[PDB]
Ligand binder design. Structure first.
Ligand SMILES: [K+]
Ligand SMILES: [K+]
Ligand SMILES: [K+]
Ligand SMILES: [K+]
Ligand SMILES: [K+]
Ligand SMILES: [K+]
Ligand SMILES: [K+]
Ligand SMILES: [K+]
Ligand SMILES: [K+]
Ligand SMILES: [K+]
Ligand SMILES: [K+]
Ligand SMILES: [K+]
Ligand SMILES: [K+]
Ligand SMILES: [K+]
Ligand SMILES: [K+]
Ligand SMILES: [K+]
Ligand SMILES: [K+]
Ligand SMILES: [K+]
Ligand SMILES: [K+]
Ligand SMILES: [K+]
Ligand SMILES: [K+]
Ligand SMILES: [K+]
Ligand SMILES: [K+]
Ligand SMILES: [K+]
Ligand SMILES: [K+]
Ligand SMILES: [K+]
Ligand SMILES: [K+]
Ligand SMILES: [K+]
Ligand SMILES: [K+]
Ligand SMILES: [K+]
Ligand SMILES: [K+]
Ligand SMILES: [K+]
Ligand SMILES: [K+]
Ligand SMILES: [K+]
Ligand SMILES: [K+]
Ligand SMILES: [K+]
Ligand SMILES: [K+]
Ligand SMILES: [K+]
Ligand SMILES: [K+]
Ligand SMILES: [K+]
Ligand SMILES: [K+]
Ligand SMILES: [Mg+2]
Ligand SMILES: [Mg+2]
Ligand SMILES: [Mg+2]
Ligand SMILES: [Mg+2]
Ligand SMILES: [Mg+2]
Ligand SMILES: [Mg+2]
Ligand SMILES: [Mg+2]
Ligand SMILES: [Mg+2]
Ligand SMILES: [Mg+2]
Ligand SMILES: [Mg+2]
Ligand SMILES: [Mg+2]
Ligand SMILES: [Mg+2]
Ligand SMILES: [Mg+2]
Ligand SMILES: [Mg+2]
Ligand SMILES: [Mg+2]
Ligand SMILES: [Mg+2]
Ligand SMILES: [Mg+2]
Ligand SMILES: [Mg+2]
Ligand SMILES: [Mg+2]
Ligand SMILES: [Mg+2]
Ligand SMILES: [Mg+2]
Ligand SMILES: [Mg+2]
Ligand SMILES: [Mg+2]
Ligand SMILES: [Mg+2]
Ligand SMILES: [Mg+2]
Ligand SMILES: [Mg+2]
Ligand SMILES: [Mg+2]
Ligand SMILES: [Mg+2]
Ligand SMILES: [Mg+2]
Ligand SMILES: [Mg+2]
Ligand SMILES: [Mg+2]
Ligand SMILES: [Mg+2]
Ligand SMILES: [Zn+2]
Lengths: 156, 100
RNA sequence: AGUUACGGCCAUAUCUACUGAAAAACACCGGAUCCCGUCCGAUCUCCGAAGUUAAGCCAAUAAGAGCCAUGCGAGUAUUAAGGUGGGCGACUACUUGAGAAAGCGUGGUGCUGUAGUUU
RNA sequence: AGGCGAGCGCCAUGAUCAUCACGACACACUUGUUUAAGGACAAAGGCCAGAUGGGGAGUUUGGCUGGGGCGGUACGACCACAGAAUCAGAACGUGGUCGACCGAAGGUACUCACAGCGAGACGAGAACACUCGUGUAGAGCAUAAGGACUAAAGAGUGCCUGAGUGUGAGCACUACUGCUUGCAUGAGGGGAAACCCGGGCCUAGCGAUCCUACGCAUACGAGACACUUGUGGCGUGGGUGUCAGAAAAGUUACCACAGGGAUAACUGGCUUGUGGCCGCCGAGCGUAGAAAGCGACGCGGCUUUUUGAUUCUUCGAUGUCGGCUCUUCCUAGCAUGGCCAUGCAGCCGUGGCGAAGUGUUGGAUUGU
RNA sequence: GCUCGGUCGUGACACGGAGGAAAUGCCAGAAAGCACGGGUUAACGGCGGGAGUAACUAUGACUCUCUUAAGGUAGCCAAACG
RNA sequence: UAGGGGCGAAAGACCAAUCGAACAGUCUAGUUGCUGGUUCCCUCCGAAAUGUCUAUCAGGACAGCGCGCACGCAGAGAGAAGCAAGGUAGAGCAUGGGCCGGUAUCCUUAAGGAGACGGACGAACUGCGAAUGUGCUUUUCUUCUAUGCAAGCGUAGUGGGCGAGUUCUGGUAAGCAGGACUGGCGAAGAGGAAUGAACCUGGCACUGUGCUAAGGAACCCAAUGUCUGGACAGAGACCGAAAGA
RNA sequence: GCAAGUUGAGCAGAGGAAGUCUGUGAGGCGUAGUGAAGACGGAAAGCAGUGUGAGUGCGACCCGAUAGACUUGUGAACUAUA
RNA sequence: GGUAAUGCACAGUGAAGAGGUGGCAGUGUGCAUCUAAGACUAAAUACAACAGGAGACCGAUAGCAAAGAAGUAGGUUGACCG
């Protein structure tokens, strides 16, 4: 039978990668955080204070409050077939800034131009949506340089 | 476990750090005049047998170390709790490193 | 263009042999009276310029070891979905999709930020 | 009121109230010695208190479990493995550990490594102390297992008792418990300072209501007022290991009741280890010679006639071992009929093939 | 287990003592029992292991060693008891 | 001589067909987590056999899944497009464990040992690493959507499950014991596999005409014939191994 | 139905009467909370009925133990012993 | 219910003439309110047999066990049963 301590089953998780042992780099400490940013959790096994519980490893959430050397992040979780919000305390050594909003922020920068012109000249924005890839395109071909294919390889 | 007989620490009444005297807490004698003692005496009185349960299936070996510390200036007291230990000594000789 | 002080990413920067280097630096170097520290002015701390490019730091060289990239291995190994497919089983063919690794070939061998100094 | 030893205790005897034996009388009480004998003793009653007490009275005698019992603890905690690469995830599944220990093995600041290997240095050897060069951990880190750590978290050296005090918010399926983190304070610590510290490098070493002991200030107190006892509030200790927590020994073949095929003792079904029977290969043996007859070391099957393994059907009932009697079926063929091989001269045999028509007995010991 | 003897200790309530305004507590005191010393199995019951050693071999009268409250005598037996 | 009492040449025997504690009557309609039963029609919606704690294991409670009444309302059991985490299958044998053999060379012996290398390996070995599955953002992103969702309040049943396909652990195995994922039977009829809870086709108000599925088409039995190769065994259509001519 | 309020308490007065009508008039809950308490104070329509679903206690959906106790109740015509 | 004694008893002990009580043990002191250890008392309240009047009750397997010669016919050794 299995046990139920705070760091159960973390032999693979919570171990350093090959040729990457030691303390964190300066960039870790010089990064500034703000309320409302999206942030991503990855535990560093060498630091023993401010570690989250291993369920949260590799998950992304939103910063709710900022303190001297730690952050409070909001998560959601299913328990007993219902949704529950959870507020997780994490030290700054175990977090990295998330990339999940990157494309959306670029798109907002384009929208922000159009939405002004749409008051002056038009009435409503064109709004620049994405579209999924359509059907295969048409082609005009010169028809020299033909290559033949054959079952010449007998494959003993 | 070895404990020194003196400890400089914060005194709540004096509101600054002071010298304290350190010793093991002592369990005092039960009083017949309290409400629980009075109730039990009356209930036991007749031909009623044993009227309250007594524990028999006991299981623990140690009990928790508890220190009483007294402020030398104002005689106020604080209670400090230290966990379970089979044996305790006050003011013995230091555990000097690198013995023969 | 190098160097030097403080750095960033942490081997394209490592490890082993050899060889070069104008100027200014960087060093080795000469002492212990004091401050400071040793079994020991070796290390650490202080006060100095008689010497020297031999060393370190910097740079080149090597069908070098190791690291980094790419091609091939290879539509190979494994795998999702499907059928009144096959086989006594062990397991395996086909149809619509996803898709490696080791080895071995070829090329590389630090890049940059802020300030100071030197034709 | 006397006496002793450098007014003290010790030794003399004289007044004041109970009081334990012993005598001698008769009045309570006792006995058909009764116009009598005993006698304040006995014997007989009453109220409290100790002792003894299966002679009796009430009651109890945990759970999980390839049925129960005996055994173990899968009953409270911790690490690793597996459970078809998030997390979770059963079995009396696998390898183990816990109920503690430590004034430093706690807190801080600085210095320097280690295990080994190759050269050296009298006694001095395999193994004594001191040196030089290499050395990504091959060492250590009190105590399982995993993770972590290199101008350190390891080994030394200095100083300190933060193993402070109030009061908030959260994480682990979250009550208890453990940990993370906010603000305010200390005539707080260590460090030049930035920084760090409200136990142990991280994941284990633990416990409610009521009662009781101690610490802390603020309350209550019966018509009024004072004091000795008492009652409230917050926090810690004293303990429940069956660990979300009753106060508890057996036996019934003299036995009762409610139920159960949720579960055993027959048969049947599935399986075939064990039991029995058959094939394949050819090392050696047979007077020569693998194979007339055998056939090691290995390998593949069939049967249900042995005993296991499991619990699907029956507990408002399927009569349980052996013998007697009587019938039918199977073949893996003991005799009787036809044949083939031979290490078949003849006699007696041995190995094989088609074949189940007819036969296969009488007794002694023993329930068999 | 039953029985006999003494106290050296413990062991109730009463009866005393000290103190306090008083209650509650405290101290002394204390029979029988218990403890301690003897008796008792036609009372309940109980009654051992290991090594060597004799002119063939076997066996061990003999020796040594551990052990106890005492180590199964006289008889009887694969017996209704192997 | 009378019931927690009698009487016994002792068997728990006997005490009015009753005795290991008599009979009569009352308290009393004693108690029951256990067995049996529980009475009219149609319409609409529709489960669970799992988790935590329990002197708990034939029982409870709390939560999860139904239904009724519903304030209200931009959502979704599906994809894309950016982004994270993971150590299984395959592949390998660089730290640790561990099997067999080595040329030149080296060390001694005149044996053996070491070896520049090759072959064989681990659920508690890893240097590399899938497919499938999981989460985050964006409708400023395709596609659907009111006969739809639905906070809140009140209250039920359930808490013995079993089986198929794909996979795993214990065991020689088992119609054996125990988990995970996606649909079933339970609570599911109809047509087909001759028959069968779960397999194939495919989800049911009540009628009438046409068409197809799965499976069939000499006869039983509604619909059948054709072409080309194999095969002779009381064979096959239903059916066992290593070994063989 | 009435509403910062609400109500068939008991009981009295009327009435050819176990009905009905009218008084007097308590109490209860509400009109705002916090603490063990001393003490302090700052949001949210209620009361009484007529019925339905549902919890708890009483025989409690219906039937069913082996047992326990109590009597100033009965029995030795069978059977035991003097 | 009565909580460091609400009421009632038994044994020891046992008052004062002045005493009792004021929902928590004790001691003191003012204040308020009563008078135990002797007796009698109407009305307003409770409920069988027997008699009278009523009813959203039951209608001969119902309603009391019993709508007729019902505690009857009949039964237990007996208590009792029907
Ligand atoms: K006389
Ligand atoms: K006389
Ligand atoms: K006389
Ligand atoms: K008894
Ligand atoms: K089992
Ligand atoms: K275990
Ligand atoms: K360790
Ligand atoms: K009072
Ligand atoms: K009063
Ligand atoms: K108290
Ligand atoms: K306790
Ligand atoms: K328990
Ligand atoms: K018993
Ligand atoms: K008997
Ligand atoms: K059996
Ligand atoms: K049965
Ligand atoms: K029989
Ligand atoms: K024959
Ligand atoms: K025959
Ligand atoms: K003998
Ligand atoms: K014998
Ligand atoms: K007799
Ligand atoms: K009998
Ligand atoms: K009786
Ligand atoms: K039950
Ligand atoms: K439906
Ligand atoms: K259960
Ligand atoms: K519920
Ligand atoms: K390996
Ligand atoms: K593996
Ligand atoms: K329920
Ligand atoms: K069912
Ligand atoms: K269904
Ligand atoms: K059919
Ligand atoms: K079947
Ligand atoms: K036909
Ligand atoms: K009810
Ligand atoms: K009954
Ligand atoms: K009177
Ligand atoms: K009748
Ligand atoms: K009669
Ligand atoms: Mg897991
Ligand atoms: Mg008493
Ligand atoms: Mg120069
Ligand atoms: Mg000097
Ligand atoms: Mg020098
Ligand atoms: Mg030079
Ligand atoms: Mg059991
Ligand atoms: Mg430490
Ligand atoms: Mg801390
Ligand atoms: Mg810590
Ligand atoms: Mg428990
Ligand atoms: Mg069964
Ligand atoms: Mg077999
Ligand atoms: Mg059989
Ligand atoms: Mg029968
Ligand atoms: Mg039957
Ligand atoms: Mg029969
Ligand atoms: Mg035959
Ligand atoms: Mg015999
Ligand atoms: Mg279940
Ligand atoms: Mg049942
Ligand atoms: Mg593999
Ligand atoms: Mg179950
Ligand atoms: Mg069907
Ligand atoms: Mg009320
Ligand atoms: Mg208000
Ligand atoms: Mg009933
Ligand atoms: Mg009883
Ligand atoms: Mg009172
Ligand atoms: Mg009629
Ligand atoms: Mg009648
Ligand atoms: Mg008669
Ligand atoms: Zn003080």
């Amino acid at each position: 039978v299995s046990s139920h301590g705070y760091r159960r089953q973390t032999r693979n998780l919570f171990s350093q990668a090959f040729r990457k042992h030691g303390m964190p780099n300066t960039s870790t400490y010089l990064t500034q955080y703000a309320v409302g940013e999206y942030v991503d959790i990855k535990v560093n096994p060498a630091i023993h204070k401010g570690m989250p519980h291993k369920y949260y490893h590799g998950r992304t959430g939103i910063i709710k409050e900022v303190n001297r050397g730690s952050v409070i992040v909001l998560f959601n979780r299913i328990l007993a077939n219902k949704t529950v919000e959870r507020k997780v305390i994490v030290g700054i050594e175990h977090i990295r800034k998330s990339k999940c909003q990157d494309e959306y922020l670029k798109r907002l920068e384009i929208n922000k131009k159009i939405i002004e012109e749409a008051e002056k000249k038009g009435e409503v924005p064109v709004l620049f949506k994405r579209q999924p890839k359509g059907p295969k395109p048409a082609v005009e071909m010169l028809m020299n340089n033909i290559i033949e294919l054959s079952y010449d390889k007998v494959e003993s | 476990v070895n404990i020194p007989k003196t400890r400089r620490t914060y005194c709540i009444k004096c509101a600054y750090h002071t010298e304290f005297k350190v010793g093991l807490l002592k369990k005092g004698k039960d009083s017949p005049r309290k409400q629980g003692a009075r109730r039990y005496a009356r209930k036991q009185r007749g031909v009623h047998g044993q009227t309250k349960p007594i524990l028999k299936r006991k299981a623990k070996t140690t009990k928790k170390v508890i220190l009483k510390i007294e402020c030398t200036k104002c005689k106020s007291s604080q209670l400090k709790v230290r966990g379970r230990a089979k044996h305790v000594e006050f003011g013995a000789e230091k555990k000097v490193k690198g013995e023969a």
